[PDB]
Amino acid sequence: NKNDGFVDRSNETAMNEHKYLNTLAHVHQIRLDLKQTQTRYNQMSQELQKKLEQKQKKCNEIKYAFLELKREVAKKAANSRTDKPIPEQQINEWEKAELQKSKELQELRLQILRLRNAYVKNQKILKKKEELAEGLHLIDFEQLKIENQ
């Protein structure tokens, strides 16, 4: 009454209360389906998240082993002639440069992968748009193909 018009459309055709109950049961079914769909969605999301956590932890452990070996060698790194090890500033500069380049290639890999997936989806869409028109899309030329026969 406060939002929609107060006019009642009782002069229309008598919509069946059976139809109303059908729509109510459809609403209940759609709500339940929403529930179970979000159930599976959360299930797969959590599975992906845990797998990503495991992969990231393995990557981190291997990366830190590599970095510890790198630093072990780096402080070992002293000139052959002067025998003065690598300047700590020079080692830090190398570390920053290497980490930045690796990270940059990493987001490049992210973007390339996502763009390539979007690519595959776009070729799939282009092929899938074979539907004729309107309206009857495939059966139309199927019967049309019948006469071509």
Partner 1 sequence: GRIKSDQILETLRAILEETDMAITEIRKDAFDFQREILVGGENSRTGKIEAEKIIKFFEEKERQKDALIAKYSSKRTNLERQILKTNNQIQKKEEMG
Q: Which residues here bind partner 1, judged by CB under 8 A?
A: 34, 37-38, 41-42, 44-45, 48-49, 51-52, 55-56, 58-59, 62-63, 65-66, 69-70, 73-80, 83-87, 90-91, 94, 97-98, 101-102, 104-106, 108-119, 122-123, 125-126, 129, 131, 133
Residue 31 CA to residue 37 CA, distance in Å, equals 10
The nearest distance, CB 137 to partner 1, in angstroms, is 9
Amino acid identity of residue 107, one-letter, is E
Q: In the block, which residue shows the tokens 């990231």? A: 56
With respect to partner 1, which residue has the nearer C-beta, 14 or 44?
44
Cis ω for the linkage preceding 5 (within 30 of 0) = no
Answer yes or no: are the C-beta atoms of 73 and 61 closer than 8 Å. no
Q: Closest CB to partner 1 among 105 and 138? A: 105
Of 142, 136, 138, 139, the closest CA to residue 128 belongs to 138
CB of 3 to partner 1, least distance (A): 26
Looking at the Cβ atoms of 19 and 129, the one nearer to partner 1 is 129
